[PDB]
Amino acid sequence: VPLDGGRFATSDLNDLYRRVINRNNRLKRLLDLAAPDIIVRNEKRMLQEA
Amino acid sequence: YRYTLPVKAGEQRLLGELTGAACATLVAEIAERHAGPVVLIAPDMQNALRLHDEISQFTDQMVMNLADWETLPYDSFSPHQDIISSRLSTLYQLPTMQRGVLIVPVNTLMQRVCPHSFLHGHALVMKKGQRLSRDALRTQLDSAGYRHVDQVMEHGEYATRGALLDLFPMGSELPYRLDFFDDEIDSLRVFDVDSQRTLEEVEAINLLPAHEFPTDKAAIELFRSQWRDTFEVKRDPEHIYQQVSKGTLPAGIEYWQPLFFSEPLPPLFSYFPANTLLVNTGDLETSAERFQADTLARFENRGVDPMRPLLPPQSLWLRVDELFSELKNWPRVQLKTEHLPTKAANANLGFQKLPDLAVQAQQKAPLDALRKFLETFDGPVVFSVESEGRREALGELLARIKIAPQRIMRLDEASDRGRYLMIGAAEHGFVDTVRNLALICESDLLGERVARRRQDSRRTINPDTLIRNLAELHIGQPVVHLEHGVGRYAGMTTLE
Amino acid sequence: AAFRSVFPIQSYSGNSELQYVSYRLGEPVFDVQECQIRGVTYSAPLRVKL
Amino acid sequence: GNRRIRSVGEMAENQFRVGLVRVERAVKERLSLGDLDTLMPQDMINAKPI
Amino acid sequence: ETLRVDPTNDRLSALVEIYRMMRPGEPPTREAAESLFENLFFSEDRYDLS
Amino acid sequence: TNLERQQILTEEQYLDALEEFGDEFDAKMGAEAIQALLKSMDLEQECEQL
Amino acid sequence: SRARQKAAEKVRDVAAELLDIYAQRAAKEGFAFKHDREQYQLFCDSFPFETTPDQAQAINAVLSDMCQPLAMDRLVCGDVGFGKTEVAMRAAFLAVDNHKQVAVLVPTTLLAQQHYDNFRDRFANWPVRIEMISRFRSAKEQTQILAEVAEGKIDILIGTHKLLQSDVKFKDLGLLIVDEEHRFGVRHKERIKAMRANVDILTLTATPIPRTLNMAMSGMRDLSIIATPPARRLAVKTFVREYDSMVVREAILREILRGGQVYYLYNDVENIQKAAERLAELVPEARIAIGHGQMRERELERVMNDFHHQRFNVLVCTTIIETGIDIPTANTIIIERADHFGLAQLHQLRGRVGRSHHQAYAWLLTPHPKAMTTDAQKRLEAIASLEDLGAGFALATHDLEIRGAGELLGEEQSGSMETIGFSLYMELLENAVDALKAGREPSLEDLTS
Numbered sequence A: 001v002p003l004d005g006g007r008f009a010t011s012d013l014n015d016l017y018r019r020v021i022n023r024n025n026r027l028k029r030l031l032d033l034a035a036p037d038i039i040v041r042n043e044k045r046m047l048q049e050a
Numbered sequence B: 001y002r003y004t005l006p007v008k009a010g011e012q013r014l015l016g017e018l019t020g021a022a023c024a025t026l027v028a029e030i031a032e033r034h035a036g037p038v039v040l041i042a043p044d045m046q047n048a049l050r051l052h053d054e055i056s057q058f059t060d061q062m063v064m065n066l067a068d069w070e071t072l073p074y075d076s077f078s079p080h081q082d083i084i085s086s087r088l089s090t091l092y093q094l095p096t097m098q099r100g101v102l103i104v105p106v107n108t109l110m111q112r113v114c115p116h117s118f119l120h121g122h123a124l125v126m127k128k129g130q131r132l133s134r135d136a137l138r139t140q141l142d143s144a145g146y147r148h149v150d151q152v153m154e155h156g157e158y159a160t161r162g163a164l165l166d167l168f169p170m171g172s173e174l175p176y177r178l179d180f181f182d183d184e185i186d187s188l189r190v191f192d193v194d195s196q197r198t199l200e201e202v203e204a205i206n207l208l209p210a211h212e213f214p215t216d217k218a219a220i221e222l223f224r225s226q227w228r229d230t231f232e233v234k235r236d237p238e239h240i241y242q243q244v245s246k247g248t249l250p251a252g253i254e255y256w257q258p259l260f261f262s263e264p265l266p267p268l269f270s271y272f273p274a275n276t277l278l279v280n281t282g283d284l285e286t287s288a289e290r291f292q293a294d295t296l297a298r299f300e301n302r303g304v305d306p307m308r309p310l311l312p313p314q315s316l317w318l319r320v321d322e323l324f325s326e327l328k329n330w331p332r333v334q335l336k337t338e339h340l341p342t343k344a345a346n347a348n349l350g351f352q353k354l355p356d357l358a359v360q361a362q363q364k365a366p367l368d369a370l371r372k373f374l375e376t377f378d379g380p381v382v383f384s385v386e387s388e389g390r391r392e393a394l395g396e397l398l399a400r401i402k403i404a405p406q407r408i409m410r411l412d413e414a415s416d417r418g419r420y421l422m423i424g425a426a427e428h429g430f431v432d433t434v435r436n437l438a439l440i441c442e443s444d445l446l447g448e449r450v451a452r453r454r455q456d457s458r459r460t461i462n463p464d465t466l467i468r469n470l471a472e473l474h475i476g477q478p479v480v481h482l483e484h485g486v487g488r489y490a491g492m493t494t495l496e
Numbered sequence C: 001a002a003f004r005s006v007f008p009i010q011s012y013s014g015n016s017e018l019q020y021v022s023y024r025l026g027e028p029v030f031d032v033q034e035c036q037i038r039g040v041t042y043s044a045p046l047r048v049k050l
Numbered sequence D: 001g002n003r004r005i006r007s008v009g010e011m012a013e014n015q016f017r018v019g020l021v022r023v024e025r026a027v028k029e030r031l032s033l034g035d036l037d038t039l040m041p042q043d044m045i046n047a048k049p050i
Numbered sequence E: 001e002t003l004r005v006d007p008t009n010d011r012l013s014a015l016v017e018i019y020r021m022m023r024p025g026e027p028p029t030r031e032a033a034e035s036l037f038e039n040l041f042f043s044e045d046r047y048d049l050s
Numbered sequence F: 001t002n003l004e005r006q007q008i009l010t011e012e013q014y015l016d017a018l019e020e021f022g023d024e025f026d027a028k029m030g031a032e033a034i035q036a037l038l039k040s041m042d043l044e045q046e047c048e049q050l
Numbered sequence G: 001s002r003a004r005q006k007a008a009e010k011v012r013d014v015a016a017e018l019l020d021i022y023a024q025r026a027a028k029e030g031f032a033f034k035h036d037r038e039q040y041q042l043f044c045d046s047f048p049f050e051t052t053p054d055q056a057q058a059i060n061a062v063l064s065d066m067c068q069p070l071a072m073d074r075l076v077c078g079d080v081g082f083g084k085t086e087v088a089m090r091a092a093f094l095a096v097d098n099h100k101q102v103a104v105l106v107p108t109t110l111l112a113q114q115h116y117d118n119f120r121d122r123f124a125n126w127p128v129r130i131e132m133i134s135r136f137r138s139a140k141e142q143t144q145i146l147a148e149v150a151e152g153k154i155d156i157l158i159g160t161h162k163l164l165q166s167d168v169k170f171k172d173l174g175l176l177i178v179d180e181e182h183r184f185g186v187r188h189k190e191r192i193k194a195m196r197a198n199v200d201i202l203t204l205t206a207t208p209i210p211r212t213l214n215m216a217m218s219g220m221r222d223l224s225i226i227a228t229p230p231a232r233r234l235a236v237k238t239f240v241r242e243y244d245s246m247v248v249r250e251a252i253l254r255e256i257l258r259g260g261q262v263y264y265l266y267n268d269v270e271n272i273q274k275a276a277e278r279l280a281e282l283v284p285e286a287r288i289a290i291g292h293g294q295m296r297e298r299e300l301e302r303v304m305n306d307f308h309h310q311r312f313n314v315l316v317c318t319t320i321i322e323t324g325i326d327i328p329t330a331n332t333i334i335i336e337r338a339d340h341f342g343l344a345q346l347h348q349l350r351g352r353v354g355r356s357h358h359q360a361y362a363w364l365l366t367p368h369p370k371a372m373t374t375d376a377q378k379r380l381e382a383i384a385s386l387e388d389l390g391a392g393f394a395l396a397t398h399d400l401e402i403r404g405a406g407e408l409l410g411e412e413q414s415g416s417m418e419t420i421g422f423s424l425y426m427e428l429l430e431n432a433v434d435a436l437k438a439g440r441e442p443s444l445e446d447l448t449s
C-alpha cells in the first residue's frame, strides 16, 4: 500500500520473503558454480536463518 | 698450513683478521683437513642460513643445517612435523658421521633433545625376509606414533588394506609399500605420491617416529603422571592435560616434551661423534645470554593462564653456564674479525678488506676503479656471482675493460696472474694477503649509499620582492606565500 | 563541554591535529511566526572556528 | 536524592555529543590519510551526523 | 569464606582470572591482563564517574 | 567403523575421522543431515524397541 | 582546477575500437610456430625442478596452441606461487627459437626488474638477448634499447607500461606475455594487440579481474588452471586481528628468530617514514627499511636489492609488492590496515609469503570491528574463509559476480554495468568479421597513422 506521499509501506512479510528468495537464488548460483564447501556452508546457514 | 688444529679436551684456537665472507672459506678449509665432523655454531639463525649458502660454494663436503622448531619459545604452533622429520633424521645420523659440516645456531644448540634411547628404540630397519606379522607391524607403528590414514601423502602416516601396507617413513623422503604374504614382507617398493605406482624396490629401508616424544598409551600415562607431579589439573576440555588424555595433541605440545620421558633431556652435546671440532662465528657469550634472557622474559610473560601452564626453561633449554661448561668438552676454532695480538692458540690470517671498487655512470669511464685495480694486482683475482645469468651480467661488464673471466669450480684452481669467475652466494670480497689472492663479489661493485639529495637550491628567484626579511610590513599589505597563494598580512599573533 | 571533550582530534599517523577555538550561533533564517507558517524548523546555524 | 533531572539542555547536549563522536571518527580518518597540505577544516568535517 | 572459595592465591592469577572472565578464548599473557585491568576501571579515557 | 549412529563430530574431529577412516561413512551437516536422520528412521520398530 | 565537473561525455567510444580490434584479430591467421623436440628438451633440462602434472598440462596446452595457425589467446589462471612464470618462459623459448621477439608486460618496475633477472638466469646458455625498459633505465639507454628493438636485435623486451607508448616499435613481434593482467585495464591490454593484429597473447594471472574471467569461462579466451601445489608449499595461515602492538611484535620476533624476513605493508607514503620509525622502536631487534614507488629510482632499486641479500629483515612497503615479487625467504606479511583492500589485492598480498618449504603466516590487522564498513567485513570474512592451496580460482569466481563481470564490449572490467549478452556479442563479431573479409576494410589503427 502507498503512504499517500509517493512512498510505499514496508509490509514486513515481503521483506522476509525477498530476503529468503535472495539467499536461495544466491545459493543456487553457488551450487551451479561449484563453490568451495565453506562458502556454500555459510550461505546454507544464512538461508536457514532467513 | 697457516695454523694448526686443536685436538684435545677443550683447547681453543682463535683466528683473527677474518673479514666478511672469509669465515666461509676458512670453515671450508678446516672441514677438508680434519678427519671428523665440524659443528659450526653460528651466532644467529639468519647467519646460519648465510653460512649454509656460502660454505657449500667453496667446498664439496656435506654442509647441512639442523632443522629447528620454526616456532618461538612457548609458542602456540606446531613445528609442522615435516620439519620434525628433518630434525629426527639428522639426530639419527649425528652419532655416526665421519665428514661434513653441520650448522647449528645458538638457539638450537641451547635446546635439549630427546634421549636417543627414543631414537634407537623407536626407529627400525626393515629388510626383505622379515617374519613380522601384518598386525604386529601395524601395532609397532601405532606405538611408534604414526597416524592411521587411507591416503598417506605426508610425513608420519600409514595405510592398511589387508595384505597391502603402505607407510611413509620419516627416514626417507618417499613412501613405501610392503605387500604382505604369509605374515612376511614380500616387496619393499617405493611408490609415488602423484602416480601411486611402484618405481623400484629397496632391499633395506629405515623408518623414524612421528614426533619427538612417545605417543602410545604407556607414554600418555607417563605424561599424566609427570603432569600431576609437576603442574595441577583443571577440569576443562581445552586444558592440555585433559586434551592429551583424550588422545589428540594441542598446538604447541612440543614444549611439554620433558613430561613424556621420565629422564632429563640430553643437551645435544651427547649426540656429537667422538671427534668433532666446533667452529665459532661472532661470539656466543652475547647471543646465548640474549636468548636466555628472551626465553625467561617470555616464560614470565606467558607462565600465566593456568590452563596450559609452562615448564621451567631449565627443563627445556641449557642454562648459559651449562652451555659454556659443556663447550669445554670439545676443541674449538673461533673465527673472529679483529686483530688477535700474539700467543699460542692464536693466529692471524691476512684478510684485508677490498679496496674502493664501485661502478657509476656519472663519469666518462665508469670502470675506472676496476680498470686500475686489476692492473696493479700481482696475484690472481676471482669474481664471485650468485646466479648463472648474473655471470653474463658481469661477463659483458668486464668486456669494457677487455677482460674475460675463465670459470673455476674450486678457489684452489686460481693460478698466478688470473682473472676468474665462480658461482655461489658469497656476499663480500677480501684480499688474502697471505697468498695474494682477491675475491670480488657482486656487492663490491656497488659501494656505499650515493645519498646526495638533501636539498635543492631554492635561493633562486629571490629579488627585491623578498626584501631580505626586514619584517617592517604594515597591516593589510598583500603577501604571497608560494605554497598557498596571495593573502593579506594581518599582524603578529601568539598561538598554542 | 562537548567541543572540549572531543577536540583536539589528533591523527594516528602522527602529523596533524584539528583543535577547537570557539563557536557562534548565527542568526536564524526565519523567526517563529513564519517558521510556523511555512512549516520549517526555527533553528540557528552553528558556526565553529576549527 | 537518588533520582536526577535531565532537562532540555542536558539531553540535547548528550545527543549532540553522540552525533559528534561519528564526526570525530571521520575527521581522524581524513587526518590519518596522507597529503594534508591541501586540506581545510571543511573537506573532512560533515554536518550530516550532527 | 570467599577466600576459601577463591581459586587464586596471588595477584597475577587474579588478573588472569579477570581476563578470562572478560574475553573467553584469546589465551592470556601478562600484559594482556594487567593493561586490561588498569584500563578497565583506572583509566581516565575509558572510565568516568561524572 | 568406530563411529556410532548419531554421534556429533567437531570440525577438527571430522577432519580427523576423514583422514583416519576416510571410507564410505556418511557424516554430513545441516538440515540435509537432519533430514537424512529422520528419513532413515522406522517408527514402528523403534516404538516396539522402546 | 574544476575537478567537480564531469568533463565531457565519453571523449571516445570504446565499443567500436574494441569490436574492430577483436574482428581484425579473428579475421586473419596468426603465425604457425615450428616446434623443435630435442632443442627444447635442453631448455627443459635447464629447469632445476620437476613440472607438477597440472603445470605440465598448462605448458603442453600453451605449446600446442602456439604450434597452430590460429592466433593464441589464453589465460593461465593458477594460484600464487605455483610456477606460472615457467609456463611463460617455455612459451617465450618456443617463440624466440623462431626469431619472434617476445614482449613481456608487467604492471610495475619491481616485477620488471625481477622478471629481467629471472629471464636472464634462465636464458643464460643460449644466444638470446634479454633487455628491460622502464623508468629505472636512464633516458639515454632507453633510446638505445628502442633502437636495438626496432633494429631487431633484442629478442625479449621486459617492460612496464612503457611498452605501450607508441614509440616502442617491434621489428617482428611474435609473442606477447601480459603478466599480472588484473592491474592494467582494457585499453592497456589491446594497445599492443591493435598494432600487431595476429600476435599470440599469453596472459598470466592468479586472480583475474571479473571481465577477463567471465570472458575466459564463456569460451572467448582459452583457460588453463594451475591449482596443483608445488614441492612443499604450505597453506598460508591467515589471522584477522584488531591492531595490537604486542601482536605485531610477536609476529616480527617469530620471523626474525626463524631467520626469515617480514613484509610490513603500510600503503601510505606520506606517513611511511613515521610508521617505520615507530616500528623500529616497537621492535629494536629488527633492521627496517622503507620501499615504495614514489622515492627516487636509484634508492628504491638499491633497497630492494639489499632486501634480497638479507641486509635487513622488515621492509615497510606500499602495495608495490602486491604484484608478484618472489623473495623466497620472506614468510610473514603484516598488513597494517587491511579493511580497505580488495579481495584480489588481499589474496595477492597473502601470496607473497610461502614460496618455499617453510610455513608462512599472514596477519591482516584491522581497526575495531564496529568502525569497519560492511563491505570490509564481507571481504575479510571471505579472505579468512579460504586458506587452502589453489584457493585463488574460487576466490576469483567469488569476486566475479560479487562485483559482476563488466561491459564485455566496453571498458569497466568490474561491475554490473548492464552489459550486452554473449549471444549478441558473438553475432556482432561474426557480422564485423564477415563485413571485413569481403571489402578488406583497412585496420582502424593504421588509419590513425
Ligand SMILES: Nc1ncnc2c1ncn2[C@@H]1O[C@H](COP(=O)(O)OP(=O)(O)OP(=O)(O)O)[C@@H](O)[C@H]1O
Binding pocket: G049, G050, G051, G052, G055, G079, G080, G081, G082, G083, G084, G085, G086, G179, G180, G204, G206, G230, G231, G323, G324, G325, G326, G355
Ligand atoms: N614444478 C615445480 N616444482 C618445484 N618448484 C617450482 C616448480 N615450478 C616452479 N617452482 C618454483 O616456484 C616459484 C614460483 O615463482 P614464479 O614467479 O615462477 O611463479 P608465480 O610466483 O606463481 O608467478 P607470479 O610471480 O607471476 O605470481 C619459482 O621460484 C620456482 O622456482
Ligand SMILES: [Mg+2]
Binding pocket: G084, G085, G179, G180, G204, G324
Ligand atoms: Mg608471473
